[PDB]
Amino acid sequence: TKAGSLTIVGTGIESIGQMTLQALSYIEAAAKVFYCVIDPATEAFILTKNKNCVDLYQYYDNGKSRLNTYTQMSELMVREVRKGLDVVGVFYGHPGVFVNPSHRALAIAKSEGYRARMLPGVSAEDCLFADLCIDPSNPGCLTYEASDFLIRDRPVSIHSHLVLFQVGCVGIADFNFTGFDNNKFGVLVDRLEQEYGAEHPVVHYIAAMMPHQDPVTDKYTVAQLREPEIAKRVGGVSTFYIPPKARKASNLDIIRRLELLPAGQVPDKKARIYPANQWEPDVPEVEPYRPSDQAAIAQLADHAPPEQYQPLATSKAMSDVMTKLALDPKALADYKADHRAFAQSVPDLTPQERAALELGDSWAIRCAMKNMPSSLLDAARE
Amino acid sequence: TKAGSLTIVGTGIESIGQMTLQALSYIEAAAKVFYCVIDPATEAFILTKNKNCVDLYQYYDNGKSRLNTYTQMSELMVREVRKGLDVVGVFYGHPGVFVNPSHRALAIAKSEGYRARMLPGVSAEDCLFADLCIDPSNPGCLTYEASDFLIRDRPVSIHSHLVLFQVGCVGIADFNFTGFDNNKFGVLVDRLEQEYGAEHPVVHYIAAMMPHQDPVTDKYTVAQLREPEIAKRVGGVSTFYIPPKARKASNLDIIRRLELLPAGQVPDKKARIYPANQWEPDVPEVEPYRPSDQAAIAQLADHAPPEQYQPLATSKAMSDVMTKLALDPKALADYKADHRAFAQSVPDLTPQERAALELGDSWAIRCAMKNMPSSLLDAARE
Amino acid sequence: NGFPWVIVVGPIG
Amino acid sequence: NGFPWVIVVGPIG
Numbered sequence: 001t002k003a004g005s006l007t008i009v010g011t012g013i014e015s016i017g018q019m020t021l022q023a024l025s026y027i028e029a030a031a032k033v034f035y036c037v038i039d040p041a042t043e044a045f046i047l048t049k050n051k052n053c054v055d056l057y058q059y060y061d062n063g064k065s066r067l068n069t070y071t072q073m074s075e076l077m078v079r080e081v082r083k084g085l086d087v088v089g090v091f092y093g094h095p096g097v098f099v100n101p102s103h104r105a106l107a108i109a110k111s112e113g114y115r116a117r118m119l120p121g122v123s124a125e126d127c128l129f130a131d132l133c134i135d136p137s138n139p140g141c142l143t144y145e146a147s148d149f150l151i152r153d154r155p156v157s158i159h160s161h162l163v164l165f166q167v168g169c170v171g172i173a174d175f176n177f178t179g180f181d182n183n184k185f186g187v188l189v190d191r192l193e194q195e196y197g198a199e200h201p202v203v204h205y206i207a208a209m210m211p212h213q214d215p216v217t218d219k220y221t222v223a224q225l226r227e228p229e230i231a232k233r234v235g236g237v238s239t240f241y242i243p244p245k246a247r248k249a250s251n252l253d254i255i256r257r258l259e260l261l262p263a264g265q266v267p268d269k270k271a272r273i274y275p276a277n278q279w280e281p282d283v284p285e286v287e288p289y290r291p292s293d294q295a296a297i298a299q300l301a302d303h304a305p306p307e308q309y310q311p312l313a314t315s316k317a318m319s320d321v322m323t324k325l326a327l328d329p330k331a332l333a334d335y336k337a338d339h340r341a342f343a344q345s346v347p348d349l350t351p352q353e354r355a356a357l358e359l360g361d362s363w364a365i366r367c368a369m370k371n372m373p374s375s376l377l378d379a380a381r382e
Numbered sequence: 383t384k385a386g387s388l389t390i391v392g393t394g395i396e397s398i399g400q401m402t403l404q405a406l407s408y409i410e411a412a413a414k415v416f417y418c419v420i421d422p423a424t425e426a427f428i429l430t431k432n433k434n435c436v437d438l439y440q441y442y443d444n445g446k447s448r449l450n451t452y453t454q455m456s457e458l459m460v461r462e463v464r465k466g467l468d469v470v471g472v473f474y475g476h477p478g479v480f481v482n483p484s485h486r487a488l489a490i491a492k493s494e495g496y497r498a499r500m501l502p503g504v505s506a507e508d509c510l511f512a513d514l515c516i517d518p519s520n521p522g523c524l525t526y527e528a529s530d531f532l533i534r535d536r537p538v539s540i541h542s543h544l545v546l547f548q549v550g551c552v553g554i555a556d557f558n559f560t561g562f563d564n565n566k567f568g569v570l571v572d573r574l575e576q577e578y579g580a581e582h583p584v585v586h587y588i589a590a591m592m593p594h595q596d597p598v599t600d601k602y603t604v605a606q607l608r609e610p611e612i613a614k615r616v617g618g619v620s621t622f623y624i625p626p627k628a629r630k631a632s633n634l635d636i637i638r639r640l641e642l643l644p645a646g647q648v649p650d651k652k653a654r655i656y657p658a659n660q661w662e663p664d665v666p667e668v669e670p671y672r673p674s675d676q677a678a679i680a681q682l683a684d685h686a687p688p689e690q691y692q693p694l695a696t697s698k699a700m701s702d703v704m705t706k707l708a709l710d711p712k713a714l715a716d717y718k719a720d721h722r723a724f725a726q727s728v729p730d731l732t733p734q735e736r737a738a739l740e741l742g743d744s745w746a747i748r749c750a751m752k753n754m755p756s757s758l759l760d761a762a763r764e
Numbered sequence: 765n766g767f768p769w770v771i772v773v774g775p776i777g
Numbered sequence: 778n779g780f781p782w783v784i785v786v787g788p789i790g
């Protein structure tokens with residue numbers, strides 16, 4: 001009911017291309033745009049999409065507490081919300097991943113009764129998984145701010161991935177336009193030596209910010225981080241990835257309670273699923289085409305879709321309206337205000353399609369766009 | 383040099399809108415598209431963007447090992463790469479976050495000497511941070527697969543965020559079109575009781591997959607997860623968020639080595655930065671407008687951009703070419719093949735702009751698009 | 765209703 | 778060269 005809204009969106013890390021379609025649609029729809037980005041091509045792109053943009057970066061200053069900057073950034077956005085404007089804040093990467101003023105501005109907007117939403121974006125950690133060819137699932141992922149990691153003595157797991165953000169500004173709470181020398185970097189290296197040993201690999205990661213750039217994926221030993229010429233390479237957009245040093249064994253009680261053993265024993269805990277983490281120290285070559293793999297590939301020749309497979313069975317009119325709801329914030333607002341009125345004014349919908357949109361039920365819509373074979377006789381209703 | 387390439391991209395979680403601009407551009411440019419997605423509107427959208435698409439979901443079957451499905455999915459993509467095609471694989475969310483066949487297919491393609499890249503996307507964890515209004519930085523984040531969490535007895539930190547994926551299929555290595563009953567869910571609840579206590583909150587999180595849907599953000603006690611009517615609500619797209627139960631104190635030795643104390647003591651470790659995590663048990667109301675905040679806001683009236691602030695100073699021709707490099711994979715390939723030839727054939731560039739593109743140096747390009755004030759006299763060169 | 769079921773990782777060991 | 782410097786979180790406590 002109340003006039004004014006705050007939508008905070010991300011740009012992703014790589015210039016322009018890592019922005020989501022919905023982030024772009026909200027930037028275009030906004031009355032006012034406030035942005036804080038990491039390259040001028042992304043800034044130029046944003047200014048082509050909205051006539052009313054403010055750069056939040058101008059609220060940093062030499063020796064000015066970042067906390068004071070964050071308060072000001074948040075207040076500039078919430079002031080325009082209180083005036084009844086649809087405001088979009090734009091932060092590079094994911095706007096809620098290692099960002100103070102987005103969470104502050106949204107909490108204030110929400111607490112005062114305005115519509116407030118964060119749209120997720122592609123973070124530096126998302127880029128890290130893609131560029132270093134690792135999956136956080138295998139074998140779990142710990143993510144920390146480097147100064148917080150040290151000050152609160154946050155635990156590491158030698159059996160899981162470790163990701164450290166802000167390794168270029170250890171112990172620095174203020175700002176300088178020319179960056180910092182990172183004189184307390186050795187305190188971080190001391191902690192990594194204690195946890196992992198002097199010979200353990202650390203990957204210096206910088207995601208490409210321009211589309212033609214290659215990422216920095218430079219493996220050093222903990223010991224090599226003490227060399228001044230290596231330490232000096234760590235800057236404002238540097239992230240560290242520390243791979244596991246060991247594989248963790250399985251718990252026999254859980255194996256029993258989950259009934260994972262048909263009868264008795266198996267080979268090993270080290271018989272890895274291909275591919276192996278290429279950053280882990282002393283990990284063996286894993287065979288991609290084991291006999292089991294070759295047998296699975298041989299079955300492709302005679303493959304047919306299972307009876308319970310649900311083929312897409314939709315229409316141009318239905319795919320057009322679902323695309324419009326995703327890419328047009330005004331259409332989505334209109335639909336959310338009155339499902340029936342909206343549904344009945346969409347041309348060329350089938351009766352089922354119209355009925356599904358009228359209800360707004362996610363399951364009805366899925367059902368209208370996919371063939372449900374008799375065999376599927378699922379429990380979606382039960 | 384070698385014919386054929388594999389690019390794996392994501393769709394994000396929310397239908398269509400959470401796809402990145404670059405993911406869309408690669409789907410449009412591909413000779414062949416292989417996809418595995420979580421809603422039919424996204425599937426329909428992909429089929430409008432490329433004439434040659436294959437649904438990978440048809441390679442699941444009842445009682446068929448997911449490992450055999452993953453081998454087949456990977457082989458269907460690499461077969462087309464070996465034939466010299468530009469192949470795009472599409473997985474929902476981030477295609478490398480809790481995905482086996484993407485990493486497999488890329489490692490095989492890379493090992494055989496083909497061009498292989500993963501483009502990051504918006505994961506379910508990215509959605510979780512946005513919808514639950516938490517920052518992984520505050521106070522660190524542990525992310526696990528629920529079965530792996532139990533089988534390898536992965537450590538929790540009561541002082542950091544915990545995120546568990548695949549909580550709806552504890553101990554299940556195969557597949558059923560109608561889903562699973564999740565009969566071993568109680569083994570997970572037992573572990574959460576041991577680590578956190580019966581009264582500790584667990585947030586049942588499901589990101590909206592359709593643009594009009596609200597996310598599920600349902601807080602339960604560990605004890606409430608034992609109620610059959612609550613346990614039954616956990617399905618294939620369910621994630622758990624477990625908030626910290628305590629704030630971790632600062633280490634005095636690190637405080638000293640980072641020189642964080644001007645003279646002596648301070649109030650507390652609990653004087654939180656606004657806003658507080660709303661999911662944490664028994665966390666006090668934090669004041670958003672402390673006297674320090676009010677003073678920072680009062681300074682906005684007399685604010686001017688600092689002398690070292692670098693205003694955008696570019697041209698339509700330069701912003702157009704940087705946008706084209708981000709949104710046109712063919713233009714990017716042409717540019718990467720011959721910087722000089724490409725740069726010299728861009729119309730309307732200034733001499734500086736042409737020179738920067740000729741070099742391809744990220745710093746030269748940034749310099750050509752931003753005004754460097756004399757004051758900045760930075761060390762970017764030193 | 766717990767749908768969809770698109771599990772594309774695991775077992776992890 | 779360690780640029781840019783766009784740090785938008787910290788201190789965390």
Ligand SMILES: Nc1ncnc2c1ncn2[C@@H]1O[C@H](CSCC[C@H](N)C(=O)O)[C@@H](O)[C@H]1O
Nearest residue numbers: 093094098123124165166206207237238239
């Ligand atoms: N290009 C890049 N490559 C790697 N890490 C980067 C990066 N840009 C930023 N970061 C990381 O992010 C920190 C700043 S905090 C902002 C992070 C951003 N919101 C995101 O979603 O990723 C940096 O100190 C660094 O650790």
Ligand SMILES: Nc1ncnc2c1ncn2[C@@H]1O[C@H](CSCC[C@H](N)C(=O)O)[C@@H](O)[C@H]1O
Nearest residue numbers: 475476480505506547548588589619620621
């Ligand atoms: N809509 C949704 N909301 C919350 N979690 C979801 C989700 N869709 C998938 N997930 C999580 O992801 C698991 C499948 S693994 C695939 C994850 C996907 N690649 C991503 O980037 O997120 C699910 O069991 C669940 O834990």
Ligand SMILES: [Mg+2]
Nearest residue numbers: 162242243244
């Ligand atoms: Mg590690």
Ligand SMILES: [Mg+2]
Nearest residue numbers: 544624625626
């Ligand atoms: Mg926790």
